[PDB]
Amino acid sequence: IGTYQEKRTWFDDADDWLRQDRFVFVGWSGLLLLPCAYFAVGGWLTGCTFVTSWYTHGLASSYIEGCNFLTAAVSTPANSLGHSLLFVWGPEAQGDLTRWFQLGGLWAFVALHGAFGLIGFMLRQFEIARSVNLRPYNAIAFSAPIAVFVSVFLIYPLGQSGWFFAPSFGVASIFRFILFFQGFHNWTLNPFHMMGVAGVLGAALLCAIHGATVENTLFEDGDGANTFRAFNPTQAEETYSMVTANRFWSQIFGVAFSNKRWLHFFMLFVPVTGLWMSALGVVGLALNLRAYDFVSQEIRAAEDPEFETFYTKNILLNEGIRAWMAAQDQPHEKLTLPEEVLPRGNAL
């Protein structure tokens, strides 16, 4: 390669073929991305269409059962299976494909194929960036979604008693996961979801602000009222006035960007940091190291029967969520709670 190219090998032929610029770039990463991602998406669609969760969660979660796009979901397996990988040949299904669907093995199938698909997609980003000679900042950015997926769908269930407490792949199932986190972990009070919320909201703010500011500081460059036509892809001059934007935001907001590179690095930086902080918080929750309570306020409320804050009300709400969701959310517990032990307000 460096001193000389030696002779062409079969690896060279494979590389030349895979690296062709066809409509769908496959590349070397394609051999891992395309099968894994295809099987993950197809498994999700088959599960949301035909597979049920009657034996896993005692819930109907497919189209053929009468569920719609919102309520259908590839539910996670039963809690008694623990963290079993649920191979279709494993000691649980023992080869029975239909029963493997019934036991919930489709969830493990989809999760593992999706994880390897995400690995393959970041590899694809690296390969494509190397092909066109660009600094692979987008793969570094995509590390954040991979961290979120790993911490939520893999680390968190492994920290708990089994895959049962993982997010089931679906809309309403994800909403159930969110409300479960609020009720049990008090996830809103956790400073890491706080940093994640700040990162995501700031990223949306930056997206909107940058788009609007660019679209409202454009140079004329044309005579039509449609400003989109007055742009050439190969032009060298900037299409919008950086000086005007800087002055405007300096006089409106107080501070303003003066460096395009720094501006776009900040746009890249904010959401990635937010998602990584949220991922660390989710790891902490996986270990049940939850920021549930402020012990000083609990002690003061216990001693003082008239001290109340919004935090105590949130604690009461969490208690209600846990008590009223435990019986049906976790069937393996077999919680036959009589109606007199469920916490409840007045006349409600």
Partner: peptide, 30 residues
């Protein structure tokens, strides 16, 4: 005493904002 610490932290953040607004380094054109 906790209230004193919280107030000090908020005052520090507001002072940092004030300095970053009115004592910023001028944006040097070219």
């Amino acid at each position: 005493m906790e209230a004193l610490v919280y107030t000090f932290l908020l005052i520090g953040t507001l002072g940092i904002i004030f300095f970053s607004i009115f004592f910023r380094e001028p944006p040097r054109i070219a």
